Amino acid sequence: MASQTITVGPWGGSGGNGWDDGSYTGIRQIELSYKEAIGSFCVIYDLNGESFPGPKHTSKLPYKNVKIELQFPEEFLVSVSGYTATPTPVVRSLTFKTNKGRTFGPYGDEEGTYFNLPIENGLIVGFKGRTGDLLDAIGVHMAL
Amino acid sequence: MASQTITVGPWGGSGGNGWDDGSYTGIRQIELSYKEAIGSFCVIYDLNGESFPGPKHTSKLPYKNVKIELQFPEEFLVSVSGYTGPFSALATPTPVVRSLTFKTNKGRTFGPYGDEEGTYFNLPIENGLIVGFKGRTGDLLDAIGVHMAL
Amino acid sequence: MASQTITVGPWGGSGGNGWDDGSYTGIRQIELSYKEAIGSFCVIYDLNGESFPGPKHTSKLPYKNVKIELQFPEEFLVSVSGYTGPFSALATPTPVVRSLTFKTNKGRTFGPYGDEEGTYFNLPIENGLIVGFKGRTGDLLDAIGVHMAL
Amino acid sequence: MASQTITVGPWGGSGGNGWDDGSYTGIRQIELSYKEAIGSFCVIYDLNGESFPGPKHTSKLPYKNVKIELQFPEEFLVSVSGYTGPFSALATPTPVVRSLTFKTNKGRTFGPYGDEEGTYFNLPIENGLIVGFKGRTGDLLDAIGVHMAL
Ligand SMILES: [Cl-]
Ligand SMILES: [Cl-]
Ligand SMILES: [Cl-]
Ligand SMILES: [Cl-]
Ligand SMILES: [Cl-]
Numbered sequence: 001m002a003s004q005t006i007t008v009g010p011w012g013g014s015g016g017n018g019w020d021d022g023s024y025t026g027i028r029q030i031e032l033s034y035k036e037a038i039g040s041f042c043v044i045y046d047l048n049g050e051s052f053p054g055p056k057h058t059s060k061l062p063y064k065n066v067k068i069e070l071q072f073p074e075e076f077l078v079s080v081s082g083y084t085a086t087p088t089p090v091v092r093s094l095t096f097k098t099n100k101g102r103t104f105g106p107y108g109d110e111e112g113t114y115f116n117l118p119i120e121n122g123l124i125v126g127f128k129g130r131t132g133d134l135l136d137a138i139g140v141h142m143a144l
Numbered sequence: 145m146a147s148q149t150i151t152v153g154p155w156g157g158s159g160g161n162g163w164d165d166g167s168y169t170g171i172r173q174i175e176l177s178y179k180e181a182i183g184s185f186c187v188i189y190d191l192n193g194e195s196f197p198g199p200k201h202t203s204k205l206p207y208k209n210v211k212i213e214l215q216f217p218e219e220f221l222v223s224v225s226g227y228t229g230p231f232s233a234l235a236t237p238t239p240v241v242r243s244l245t246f247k248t249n250k251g252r253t254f255g256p257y258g259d260e261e262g263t264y265f266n267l268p269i270e271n272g273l274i275v276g277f278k279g280r281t282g283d284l285l286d287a288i289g290v291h292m293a294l
Numbered sequence: 295m296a297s298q299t300i301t302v303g304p305w306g307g308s309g310g311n312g313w314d315d316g317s318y319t320g321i322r323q324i325e326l327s328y329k330e331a332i333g334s335f336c337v338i339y340d341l342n343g344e345s346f347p348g349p350k351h352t353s354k355l356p357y358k359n360v361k362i363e364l365q366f367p368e369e370f371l372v373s374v375s376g377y378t379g380p381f382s383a384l385a386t387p388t389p390v391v392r393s394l395t396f397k398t399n400k401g402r403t404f405g406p407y408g409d410e411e412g413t414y415f416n417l418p419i420e421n422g423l424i425v426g427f428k429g430r431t432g433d434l435l436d437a438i439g440v441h442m443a444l
Numbered sequence: 445m446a447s448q449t450i451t452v453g454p455w456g457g458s459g460g461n462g463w464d465d466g467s468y469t470g471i472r473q474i475e476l477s478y479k480e481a482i483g484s485f486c487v488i489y490d491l492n493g494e495s496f497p498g499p500k501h502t503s504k505l506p507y508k509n510v511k512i513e514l515q516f517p518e519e520f521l522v523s524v525s526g527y528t529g530p531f532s533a534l535a536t537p538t539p540v541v542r543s544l545t546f547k548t549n550k551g552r553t554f555g556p557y558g559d560e561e562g563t564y565f566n567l568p569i570e571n572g573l574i575v576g577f578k579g580r581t582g583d584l585l586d587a588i589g590v591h592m593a594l
């Protein structure tokens with residue numbers, strides 16, 4: 001009231017429109033749109049054993065849709081990696097890896113800088129970012 | 145993959161059925177019913193700036209209903225106190241939540257609700273926040289506990 | 295800056311002088327002295343796998359000394375309970391820690407040490423660890439509280 | 445009772461001997477050596493308001509030594525960044541920490557130290573604190589990771 005979490009990032013540029021999904025109990029699924037860059041980014045979180053759709057950050061862009069369906073609570077994200085009209089940095093590519101050894105991605109275009117967040121202990125419990133159009137910047141909330 | 149929180153309590157007895165609302169961003173409202181003990185207990189949580197109603201832990205008992213509306217996020221609980229002990233109207237012979245009192249950082253006292261008999265319990269919080277309630281409910285609130293986060 | 299933890303309590307009075315050991319990795323040992331109240335109270339903490347004696351909060355009252363040696367990391371506290379109230383030997387009628395009891399996840403009970411008189415307090419821990427103690431000491435233990443972490 | 449923290453990383457390779465300082469209250473000072481890669485890496489932590497030197501991870505290499513003195517508690521790290529990659533001076537193409545840069549909430553930049561060659565890595569902290577370091581050291585700093593807390 002209001003509880004807080006460890007927040008890392010963002011990786012990308014000053015948008016665009018800033019958004020913060022806040023924090024939850026975990027992640028059950030993630031949905032993205034990809035081609036040149038990452039367009040749409042949405043999350044279906046876990047909230048105390050139930051699914052909870054996070055606010056939509058959709059891009060209208062004609063990009064391919066992907067669905068990352070984790071075996072929650074047995075399977076979780078151990079890493080978020082990727083690449084970062086306007087010369088402002090945007091999210092070009094995203095990769096996600098799990099504790100069970102499954103690699104989802106790379107999606108988009110691996111160009112420009114590069115970012116990597118390996119997680120040894122803890123969990124991603126929420127996403128933060130900037131969506132114009134497309135995904136400009138992305139960040140994570142962490143908790144034990 | 146399920147995030148966890150510090151969990152303290154429960155205060156009360158092993159009767160009824162165990163429930164756990166889980167954890168959220170904070171507390172907006174507490175609704176309870178009382179008479180000589182605590183009946184119903186339901187919470188409206190904050191979940192990332194929006195109201196999120198927790199599961200209801202309703203009692204069919206003809207008790208008086210009360211709404212504890214906190215001025216979230218400026219105002220939050222700094223203590224949860226009360227009394228637990230057997231209740232003579234029975235048929236449960238194990239302790240039950242007889243009374244509850246909530247105090248905030250703004251200096252507001254809510255309660256006592258119920259009947260102040262049995263063993264007193266007090267959780268003063270010096271640093272951190274209640275983010276969820278856990279308990280046991282039968283015909284009454286048998287036990288109560290809390291999740292804490294920073 | 296300075297990292298923080300969840301802090302609960304204190305239980306007891308406002309007498310003596312306030313102290314806070316701060317927070318560490320866990321608890322290895324608790325040393326206390328008792329008779330009709332709690333006198334001395336010192337802790338040997340874990341700090342990243344090494345022992346770290348915290349500050350001493352010694353009483354010069356000839357009480358019985360006891361060493362609570364916890365089998366760290368397998369063994370940890372699941373509850374701190376006790377009694378607070380004024381003590382016959384004045385010149386202050388402020389409530390003091392009259393008794394303490396410690397229970398572990400391995401079903402070990404340490405105490406009650408002291409005199410089980412006044413107001414009982416109980417902190418059952420369902421999820422999390424005590425990582426530090428805070429309190430107040432004058433001639434004896436006036437108040438006690440804990441830091442908790444995951 | 446072993447308390448845990450969020451641990452991110454490591455960044456770098458599998459060479460050297462793995463180490464973990466564990467977690468503390470905060471960071472007071474960072475001592476490192478550098479030339480074409482990072483050599484030595486030693487931290488002075490804060491432990492409940494007092495300085496606590498962690499274990500040394502000293503490189504035998506004739507490198508340039510530097511002290512990053514942080515104005516704890518008001519000044520703390522908001523960023524750790526650098527470069528990771530193979531080093532031509534080595535018999536193995538195992539990636540090592542080539543460069544390090546540290547940024548504080550007070551707008552102070554420390555570095556870049558070393559060679560800005562290989563794979564760039566960046567850890568911005570929007571909320572929370574670095575409370576400990578973990579890594580791998582042989583002749584050089586092969587890997588680096590961080591413990592985080594609120
Ligand atoms: Cl291309
Ligand atoms: Cl390419
Ligand atoms: Cl007496
Ligand atoms: Cl007696
Ligand atoms: Cl007696």
Ligand SMILES: [Cl-]
Pocket residue numbers: 410411
């Ligand atoms: Cl007596």
